[model samples]
Structures are given as C-alpha cells and as structure tokens.
Target chain A: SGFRKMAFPSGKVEGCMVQVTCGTTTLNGLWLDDVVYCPRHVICTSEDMLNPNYEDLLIRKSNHNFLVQAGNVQLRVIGHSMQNCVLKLKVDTANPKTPKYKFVRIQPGQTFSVLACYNGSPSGVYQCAMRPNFTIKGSFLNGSCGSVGFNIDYDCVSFCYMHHMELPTGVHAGTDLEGNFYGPFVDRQTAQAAGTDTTITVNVLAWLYAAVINGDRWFLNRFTTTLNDFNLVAMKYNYEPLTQDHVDILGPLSAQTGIAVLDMCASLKELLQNGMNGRTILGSALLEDEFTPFDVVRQC
Target chain B: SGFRKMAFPSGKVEGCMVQVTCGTTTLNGLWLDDVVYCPRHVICTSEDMLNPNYEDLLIRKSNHNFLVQAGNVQLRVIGHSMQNCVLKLKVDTANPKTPKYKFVRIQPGQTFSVLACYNGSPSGVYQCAMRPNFTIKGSFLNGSCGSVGFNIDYDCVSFCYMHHMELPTGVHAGTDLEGNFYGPFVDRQTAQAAGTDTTITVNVLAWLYAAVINGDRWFLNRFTTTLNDFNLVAMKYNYEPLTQDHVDILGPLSAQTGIAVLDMCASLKELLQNGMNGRTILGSALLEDEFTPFDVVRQCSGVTF
Candidate 1:
C-alpha cells in the first residue's frame, strides 16, 4: 500500500485500556433542529451537542518540604510551594546544605493560598496573597491562638492605595469557579470572554478592609504589604510584567448597578485621610454606606 | 447620553427568534469572594451556566422588501434576507413598445450573485456589479428564477467571527492533537499505556485530511470522508472561489474571497499553485463547524423561506 487512502475516523477509539464501555452517542433535543453555540474553549459535555459547557479545571493540594543548610546552619522549613503561582520556592533535602530556588509556575487551574489568624479563633478567612520565598526569622505560625507570618524584602504601593496584582494562574476561588481568573494571561494561552474581571490586587484590598471593619485588624499592615509585594515580586523577581487592564474587554464599569460598587469608600476618607493610620473602624464607628459600599453580588 | 462604562451582557438571553438581535460585546470577569467571582459584566441565567445555556440565538423564517429608483424605472427587490449572515438582490416593467433606460445599482449585501431564482428562470437579467457599467435596457422579474450565486457573498464566508479567517499553506492544517485546536506549536500533550493522548504529528494528522488533496476532480461528493479535504472539493458543491465568464470581471477573483476565486477557475493548473502558497482559497482548516453550508441545515429555514 503506497500511502494509499484509508478511511479512519478523526475521533476513532483505540481500545479498552482498563474497561471499555461504548454505545451510540446519546442525545436529547432534536438533532439538527436544536443547536448549541459552544464558543472556542467551551466543550460539548454530551456526546451530542445537546449540552455544551466550559471545561472543568482541577487543582489538587501539592505540598513539599525542604531542609536548608545556610552555611552550617541546618534550617528545615515546611512550605507549601507558591512557585507554581510565581512565588518559586525550591529546597533540596538531597542537597541538604544548599537550597535551590527557581520560580514554580502557577498554571491555569493550580494556584496558591495561605490562612492566618491573629488573636482570633482558628476559624479565619484564607484569601489572595502570593509571594513565595517569604523570608522568616521569627515564628511563622497558623494556629488556634494566633498567626505570626514573615514580612521581609517587601514594599507597599498602590493605584492610589490600591496595590498592584497580576496573577500567573487562576486563584482557588471554589470548586465551581475553578478559574476565577482575572488580570492577564502572561503565558501564551488565553480565553475568549475575560474569566474573572477584577484582579486579586484590586479585590484583596477591598476584602482586607472587610476584615479590618470586621475587627480583624492585625492583618491590615502585613496584608497591604502583601498586596504591593505580590506585584513587585512578580515584576522584580519573577520578571513577569505588571500590566493591569483592570478588566479585559470590559470598556467601562457600570453606573453602580446595585450589583457591586467600589466608589472609593467615604468611610476610607475618614479611615485614610484624618487620623487614619492606626485607628480601627470599630474605635471610630463606620457609617452605614461604608459598611455596604462593596456589596458585590456574583452569579455563575 | 454622554458615555458610560456599561456592563452589557452577551450570550445571555432567551427568545431565540428566527431573526435574533445580537450585538458585538467585549467582556471580562471579576474575582470577588472565595465563592462569587463575577465578570465586570456579571449576568448569568442559570446557576449551572449550562441549563440556561446561552439563550439560544434562534433564527427563524424571515424576509424583507427593498425599493430602489433607477432611471424612470423603480426596481423593487424582494430578498429573503439572511441577516448579518448573507446576501442582496432585484426588479421591473410596464408598456411593451418603448424601452426606458435606468441606471441600477445593487447596493450590495456583500456582492451580487447569479445563483438566485425566479420561477426556475433567472428572470432578472442583471450584470455582476463587480465592475463598470449597466448600460443595457432589459427585463427583470421577481416571480421565479435560478442563477448560481457566489457563497463568498454569503457572510461567515470565512472564519473571522464566525468571521474572517485565512488558511495559509501548511496552514490549511492537518495533524490531530487531543483537542479541537491544531496549530503549529502550543499546548500540553500526554499519554498512557492503555490509551494514547496527543500523538498525531503534522505528518500523520495532516495526512488523513490531506488524502483528498491527492485527487484533482470533484469526486469528493461521492468520496464522503474527503469532506475534510478541500483539494477535491468541486466548485459546484463548495459554491465559492467565485468563477465568472472571464471577460466579465477583473478577471481574477476570490482572494481571502472572490477575487482569487475567478482567477483560479480561469486556469485549470491553478490547483497546484493554490496548495503551495499561503493564500489557500480552499484547503484543510480547524476553524468553524457551525452556521455554514457545511452545517447543511443553515438553509432557507431562518428568515421567511
């Protein structure tokens, strides 16, 4: 057969590796009559186009430990890697003395997260804050009593107190919204409609204020420090650029659709402008508008 | 109104009419709580994101009437409109003795085509507006006719948006990857002993669809699997690479569309050069699979048959 034409199906099945189960592609709606408009990356879940939806992105818990010898000092550290999320942290227990470090790329689905509580119950919120290789001299705790995290090689800046945030991978929003992604896709790959509009850089500050108003003020300073440093680490260390389009394709934000509004908190004016530095929201009561300013409502 | 950074929704509606209302909208999502991450334009129909799956863009029976005035003659045209998808057409009469001359223009829905019909006869004797003048005094009718028009005139002519797209050689594409995208180099591939993953190279992947490329004639209708190949695709069925009676138009047609089309058909040896260059009029590609003749059912169903 000299490269003769052979009729092979494009999606031909190759065999049963484990247990092969096959049948006609079951369908619902009228075959030709009913149509589905599954855009670019959206997949047709049903064998037929009866139902089509976006692909499900999965991220599993990946934890690794490392022992480092900083010139005869045996320092063992247990760190959940953020290299995948641009905070590249590598330690070779094998090469016990010299800990190797290179940024671990945070791909589409897989990301990073950390939980810290201060003088509160272990029941605390874990949110967007990624900057691996966080140097710790004192105790780095995440326990029932309180949290003592590290903050070195860090800086604080913002888009008017709004820190810069550009994510490499989607964050750990929820199982449902795996790729609750926003910001940019530095990696070659991209998506049609912007996944998540506002970025972690933008939201973290809002959420941090939520924590501050909720009487969880211990995380205020370091958390804000976490915000700007994320951008700096990405730009300065990881060499990833800081290009914030705010929201892709979305031209202008709506006219406070009662859905969600971030109109530079009036509470923050009193919170930031006058006697704002060390004053907590509770110490000098917050106005009603300030409390519900960022009443953001989201849908699937 | 002045201006507003409004968050309008796309792909979020019901009432899929035969003639639907859709606009080009650009959008992006926003991350809120651990649970709710909405797009800047947050609007969802169902919780599952599929149950209410993109309020169907149902296009049904539709038609429109247009009137144009040319010389003392009012050429009234009735075209079964193919909204934002395809075409434009025409025309007239009264009194047998003296003929009145009128300068008529198609105002083209893309371009004019002959493949239209009126009582099985192409009653309208109109010239392809691809060029110069319409100086002939003639009879035009809307009763019944048949003249093979160019599908290139049809929207979705190329995959740019269900829009414009080009398939440069070595680009008409072959080779099977795990997914729908089959491009030069981009992606993650994997495989297991039991089943295989992305193993098809441009060599083998392109080979399957390229089989028809080996042929010269339009035997493709008979050779169904060659459906993927563009080489054997005959002009009669494919309906593009617009061909003309040569002396009628600029002579070469169909480039990215119609210009290159006529030029190619002008020469029989055009196929050989067609596949060699970047401007492949017809070949293999992994672009659109919906709303084209290829979809077949996109027929005279939507917009008043």
Candidate 2:
C-alpha cells in the first residue's frame, strides 16, 4: 500500500519531506513521482520488509529540490541545488520493450529541457522517471512527483499538431490578388498549386524577415534552402529570379533591424547562390500589369 | 598617361598621396586597389562625366587608406576610415554584360571580403572598381590603381581543385573482404553487385560521419536522400535493414556534436523507415567468406565509393 496522503498548503509543499511507518519500522522519504519512496530501498515504503539493507543503512535523501514539467515534445527539469548536479530522466511506455532516457546537467537555479521523442505514435500510458544520479539507490522522483504523473497518452497526430503550425499569413490587401493572397482556397489542389506558384515566394519573404529578426543558424539554413529551391524552380519555369530584390529588401531590413541579420542573410544567400547562373527574367506577369507593388505585401 | 613608379619604403606608403600633373591640371589621388586614379574628372573617367553634377563636387578622397587583394573566388577590401563608411566594390568580367556589385559598411580599421563569382569558367580579363560612397561622383579607384589590373583568368577546374578535398578514411581494419569493402571490381556488374552486397553500409557510415563534421544542410539532405534510396532498394530486395547500428554510431557522435545533428539524423531515419518491413536476406555468395575488409581497398577502389 502507498503512504497515506497528507494535506499541505498550496504553495508550501515543493520541498516537503514525509515520514512513513509500517508495522514496527519507520522510514523517512521524499515526495518523488508523487509518492514517498525511501532512497535506501528499491521497492516502495510499504514493501520495505523485502529490502534486506533497509534496516542497517541510513539513507539521506538529496537536499536538492527538483521540478519537472512535461510538454508535448519536450521535458523540462529544474534543479534548485546549491551547486551543479547531473539528473537523469527516463521515459518508459506501457510496453517493456520501448524505453527512452536522457541525461542533463543543471546548474543551480537553472532549467534544462530535453526532447523526449520525435515520433509519439504508439497509443498507451507512458511513465517518466527522474533520479539525481545513475546509481541504483540514488534519490529518485517520478513525473507524478508533483502529482502530475508525467503520464502521457501518446497520440502521434495530436503531438504533430501541437508542434507544427500553419505558415502564418496575417493580412493582405492589394490589386494583384494572386501575389497578395497566401491561403484559404476552395480545394487542396488549388491551394497547393497556388502555394507552389505564388505563396512560396511570400512565405520565403516572411521567413527571411523572421530569420533576420532572430539570428539563428537553423532559420538561416531554412531561408537559404527556400531561396535556393525557389530560384531553381524559377529557373526551370523561367520565372523572375531573385536578385537585386534580395539586396533591396535586405537594405531596408538592415536599416530597421541591426546589421547582424543583414550580414548573415547576405552571407547565407551568397553561399547558396554560388555557381548559379545570372540570367535576367521579367517580373511576375500577374504583378507587371497590376499597379500595386509586390514589395508592399511584405509588411510583416 | 599613368604615373611612373616611385621607389618608397614599404611601411610608409599607406597614407601617402601622389600628385600627378597631367599637363597644367594638377591632380592628387591616393594609391588604392593597386591603381591610382585621380578624383578629378579626366577623359579616361568618361563614366563619371556622364553621371551629371560632377563639376560642383568637393568630394574629399577618404584620408583612410584602402588595400585590395584578389583570390580565385573572393575580393578582399581593407579600409582604414576614421568612422564607418559605405563602400561600393564592383566586379566586371571580360564580358561586358556580366558585372557584379556589392555594398558593404566598413567600420574604422575594418577588412571586408566579398565573393566575386562562383564559377570562373569564362577566361578573360576582369576589373574591380572601388568607391568610398554610393554617389556617382565619389572618389573612385580601380583595382589597377597601384599598377596591378586586378585581372582574372578563369579556370573552373583549378578553382574547384582549391576548395574540394578528398574524403579521408584513416582508421578501418576488418575481414570478409566483400562484406567489409566498398567498391572497385573487375567489371561494372561485379562492382554494382559487390557494392550492394557490402559497400553501401560502410559508404553510408562514412557519409554520416562527414555530414556530422560539416553540419551542412545540403550534405545532411543528401545523406537523408541517399539513405532513403538505399532503404527503398533494400526493401525491394529484402536486405538486412539498418537498425541499432545507426543508433550506436549516432549516439556518441550526437553527444560529441550538438543534439541537433542527432535529431536530424533520427528524424531522417524515421521518415525513411516508415512502413518498411524488415526481412533478412542472405549475403551475396560471392562475398560469403572473403578475408579482407572492404575498407582496406577503398583507396579509390577504382569503383568510386
């Protein structure tokens, strides 16, 4: 049987310790995985009789406090220790065959988040275990330590939905409908074709702007790839290629933001565009006749 | 007429200005881009005359000196300005039509390099122009300012040779010759068959390692596509699927590198392995009991692994 539940004030129970008594034996344990488990015994406090070393050994629970939060794809562990400590987090599913683990180093008052799994397809109850060290008798805590079993019901579709977001296209108003609009078409084919034809350009533009906003290599790589693919497709179809337009857009963006983003964008663009042909193509046919400029649509 | 060469000690010429008296109109210009061009308009500088508003300009040539160096693919510009200054460096090839331009902000005592062009295939002379500002009447200096034309002769193959290096495989010792090796057989059929039998695995391993080292998305993408194609072919033929071996190799590599590489490799693997059924196939009879590791002969192996 598990230890009887004790009531404590809402905000005052994070670092609390519990005392468990069974028959004539008494033991002290910590609130880990939402259960009182003595560090000296591999089994729960109720099954202490089976642990041969429980009576002779005096185990001291870790004074360091730990806080864990599980997200759709990430698990964050916060350690409130006086110094640096290593923590191991284990993710186990209902089946014995599938078990995952991650180790993290947390400085005092620091939080470390580890990706649990990329594909969360299998449907079943999952448990996450946390321990201060890798030793068998280390101070352990379960996801349920804070009363939230870290229990995850695996739904691959939902997990993907949580992480993947639709390409954000806020608002637009212009004469050239094809150039301005991004999505919300009647059918998937039309949407995809339209996306392939026009939206990709605008999406690339927006992504370039965002990448400039956050000087991240991942975003820069994404922008570079997008521009490269766009240019390649453009070359194949004889569509207007991106040239001075990149410089023009970058100049103003650099003026608005710092030069760091501009430098990175230019460098990445140069790297990606190496060995590319320099044929001049006419601007978009749709925008050529229309009075409004396509650059206006890049207000984001 | 160009100014005659002057013999001056090396370290003192950076800030020195040479005065040229072409007929009665005396002009003073500093050495830049290996050439010296006067700020004052001359018949040779026809492009600036047509630019308009060239007469009423008191354009002070940057007191801060500039140095230009040309490599196969890049043009470096060194500026020693008192404050931040905008610089326009133009690259023109032998063909009049193909001219490239780059604008850079050079901080005080800054050195900037711009990639001129990727492919250097079209052989002929090339010229570089430098200006302190974007205006049409700014102090312009050609790379030939100090007497060097900054001319370029395109050699695509040579340029590639400078950047591309052979993949290194120093540590590999094994057995079951066909099973351990990658390529190079007597004939195309034999090579292809032997590669499929054993070489593909080690090739994948080598590419995976290279991809990690480069962290180049293109390389990663190539590796993913290669693995995908390999697995598709394996599925078609019922071959031994890659499993824990990938994890074992990737685990430490990921630990050494960042988790991003690991995550990408794992994601790519999952995408490639989806819906794939693992069925073991017998090894090629030709490679059953060979004693040599395939890697040993991978030294060009004649088969180009």
Candidate 3:
C-alpha cells in the first residue's frame, strides 16, 4: 500500500502529504487520495469529530490541499470555533448583497469545497487557497488556532498554457497554468522573463505548487474587509478585459502591458506565480505572523 | 428785497440762491423761499404747470434745495414724472422685506419729502441729500436730467461731537456731527487731528457744505443693488453697542476705536466724512462710474469672535 494508514486526529506539519521513510531515507509523499480519481482532483475529508464539519484526510487535526481544472467555481468561506480569533472579511463571490458573514473552519493553503457541510451554502462551496491573517481584533488568527483566509476561483481553470521553466531550486522544469511549480515568485521581472520572449504556461502541478504556497504567494486578503472599504480594480487606458480585432496589435498596448488581451490568461497564470502583491507566503499556523500593516483598513 | 422776486419757470446754475447784479455790483443772494422762518426749514414748492408736480420757486425749470434740523427723519423718496430717466435703487430704511423699490423724482441738493407729494406715503418721507448719478442702464445720470441718488438719516443727532476743521480750499472751520465742515475729507488723519486734545462743535451750514457736495463724498452705492447682496456690519471684541463698567478701558479699547460704544454715532457722523470707503466723489451722470468690483459681493461673511 502506498500509504501505510495508522492515523486519527493526530497533528503535525505535513500538509496534504505525509513523510514516508526507511532507516536512512525519507520522502514527503502524497496520500492515496491524490491519484485515486486520475483526471479529477478528489477531495478526501471526514465529519469533524466535534461539529461534523471537516477533518482532513490522512492526517488528523489538519486540512488537506486541493486543486481544480476548467471554467470557474464559487467559494464563500466561513469561520468556525473562531474562539479568540475574530474573522473580518467578506465572501465576495456571493450575491454581494446577500449572505453577510458567518462561521466555519479552514487553514491557510488547505483546500476544500463543502456544499455538504452542515454550515455550508451553495454560495459557500469552492476549491480555494486560504490566504492567512484574517483575524481582525486578536493577534492574527491567534486564539482561533484552527484557520484563517483563502483565495478562490469563481470560474474553472481554462486554457492551461504551458511553458518550460528553470529556477534556483533543483526542479528545472515547466509551467501548467498554475504558478505552483515551485513556490510563490519573489521577482516579477524574473518570472516574466522565464518565458524568455515567450509566456511559459505549465503545464501542471507547477500550477498550484509551492509558488502559491510559500517563499512568496498570490495576494488574497482584501476579501476580509467590509463593503464600505471597497475592493475592485477597473483597468483603464481604454482597454477592457476581453475583445480585440479592431485593436492595434503587436505594439505597446494602451494600458498595462503590450498584448494585454492576448496575455490576459497568462497574466493570471503569472498571478499564481507571484506573491500576494509582493507578500512573503508563510504557512505559519498563526495567520497574523505573515502580514504587514499595508493589509489594514484604508485611510478613510 | 434781497431776492427781488421777478420770474417764472426759469432755469440757472446757482443752488438755492438767485444772483442779483447791479452791473458794477454783483451778488448771489438767498431765495425768499429760504429764511422765511429761520428756526425751521420751510418746504417751498408750487403746483406743476406740467404734471402738477414740483418746480423751483424763482427758477421754473429747476428743483430748489432744502435743509433740516434736530432729529432724524425718514424720507421715502418717490420717483416723479420722470421721462427718459429710468431709476434703479432700493429704499433700505423700510421694513427690510416689506416695501420694495419704487420711483420718485428728486434732484441732487434740491430736496423734498412729500407727505403730500400725492405719490408720497408715510414711509416715503425724509430729509436727505440726493447724492448723485443712479441711472443703472444708461450713462450715469445722463438720461435722467432731474436727479440721481441721496444719503439719509434714520435717527437724528444724538450727540454732536465737534472738531476744528481746516483744509486747502479756503474755509477753515470746525465740525458739527456732519463732516460737511468744508466738504468730504481726503485724509482721515488730517480730519481726526483737527480736534487736537479736543473736539470743536458748532457745525451749522458747514454740515451739508461742499464737503459732501463734490471733491469727495461718503460711500452710498450698494443700495443701488438687489437684496441677494446683503449689507450690514457687526462689531466684535465682546463690545456691545451700548455698555461699559465691566469693561477694561483706556488702553486700545477692545475693537474698533477705544470709544466704540461711545463713538458709534460719530462713526456714522464720520461715515458722512469718509469717501465711499475711500473713493473720489464724481458728479458723473453714469451711475456705474464710481464703483469697483470689491463692492459686488462678499466672500460670504466668513469670520469669528
């Protein structure tokens, strides 16, 4: 058996994977749940021991990682057993006007979509990356040592562009739409140049690899704020997110960068590669450990 | 007879007086209409052969000048059989919101307040100086050959603080509440100092003399505008218009002048001495001739205690 099962509610640092070892050898291997479904990502979870919520598969007391492909999906994460940890954020994917804020449990980077959870709503289900430090009043995720924040996909992962890639880490490889190849990117110029006059879309696991996990990560905290403090960016310089033909091509695109429309998907592909707007991604249990004051409320 | 009455509907340049020359002898004597009864100013007029309005006694074609004494009187000047002269002005002394502007025929210097001018109402009466040029649209007072503007007094001389007044032109005299001593004052220091360690008062004719007649005159135009543009001044420094004892005095008394409350009337009296907030007095018929943009509107009365 690939996985020697012998676990229950026990806790350690291994995320969706476990450490398998011999006398002098050790390897971080995935739980059997990973490849079971082959083409689709299979979510492995159990009724939480206390509230029937969710206990990650393989490991106890911890959450497992997840991935999705195609189109987009909706995710409305809720808080739970928050305890001393107070969550201050919103489910932006919801009807915006409906579903205020509620409770649930989830840890950073751990992935799950539970329409089946007793507290889950259709609007709340999603495959997501829980970005941390949502604890508003307390010492970031301090008291509610359970979970914090997450990044989500309203639509499925479409058009997975592939690109050959190389880096400081030994894995000199390629990309699969997701920048998770290694971990979050530190320098934007380096990541954009890797495609070398070409955009390197990877190809697979690199999509959600450590790129989105640590060292650096994708930005995903604003959802933690209230409505009054708004969050939305409208691209200007006259370019819309989609559409072309009449557009003058090949030269410097009016805004952002040249070939914006063509590069839209790749930009997002690059998105997962970069850190939270240049934030260091730390899989710290205490959510607060990884944020700066720039993450606080905006000046009125 | 000093006036030697001998005419009808005649016109001349002399104001309130007719010239009597004996070839080798010449004189500008007072009209019999004047001094008929010294102590009080006599309102002399004749039924208009024209609209049964008013015409100067000796000079038929002109308006005669009149004077006043004692308490302040309300003169609601009404427009007369004015022809090409279209007047545009307001009666500020009336119930602010009540009486709107109306018409009246009056000439500068040649004064009249009809309790009986048929077109005259109780509120339309007063002893005033028809200042000058008030025709809004046309050239100053050009179209209206008769009269222009006037200065008024609501309350009479409560206290007449006097001062020795002397200046260039000839007459060296003193003041009598009214700064008409020699005419409007040019320099404020010169006027205030004339009272040196004192204040001279007698100020009869010197009250309405040429001072206010020409060279320069007091401010009196904002009245020609509408109400949106308000006019009023409130003094600060915790000093009310009338009160003292509790106040610390002698040294730079709070606001305005040291004797503000005490000199409230004098400021008005001096109000007549100053040239429309420092403006040269011109008898131009065009009402627009003497104003500056500053007189238009306030930046919205911004201030603090």
User: TM-score, each model?
Assistant: 0.15, 0.15, 0.12
- lDDT by residue (A1-300, candidate 3, tens digit) is 000000111011011122222122222211222210110011111222222222222223111122211113322222111111111112223232111122234323222221101101010111222222211111111011111112112212121111122233211221122222212322121432222111111111122222232222243222222211111111221112221321232122213222222233333333334523423222111112112111110000
List each candidate's DockQ score.
0.01, 0.01, 0.00
How would you encode candidate 3's per-residue C-alpha lDDT over B1-305 as one tens digit per residue? 00000010001101112222211222221121221111000122112222222223223322223222111333222211211111111222332211112223332222211110110111111121212221111111101111112211211111111112223221222222222222333212233221211111111112212122222234322222111111121122111122132122311321422232223223323343442342322221111211111111100111100
- How do the residues A1-300 of candidate 2 rate in per-residue lDDT, one tens digit apiece? 000001111111112223332223332222333323222222124333333343232233222222222212222222221111111222221212221211122111111111111112110111111111110101111211111111111111001000001121211111110111112321111122212322223223433443344332332343333555556654553333555555464455556545433344443354334522321112110111111112212212
Q: Judged by lDDT against the true structure, how good is candidate 1?
A: 0.19
Candidate 1, residue B16: lDDT:
8
Local lDDT at A269 for model 3: 31
lDDT of 3: 0.19
Number of clashing residue pairs in every model?
A: 55, 16, 71
Q: Pick the candidate with the highest TM-score.
A: 2
Question: Interface RMSD for every prediction, one decimal?
Answer: 29.4, 37.4, 50.9
Model 1 chain A: lowest-lDDT 10 consecutive positions: A11-20
RMSD of each: 32.5, 27.3, 38.4
lDDT per residue as tens, model 1, B121-178: 1111111221111111111121211112122212111111110011211011111111
Which scores higher on TM-score, 1 or 3?
1
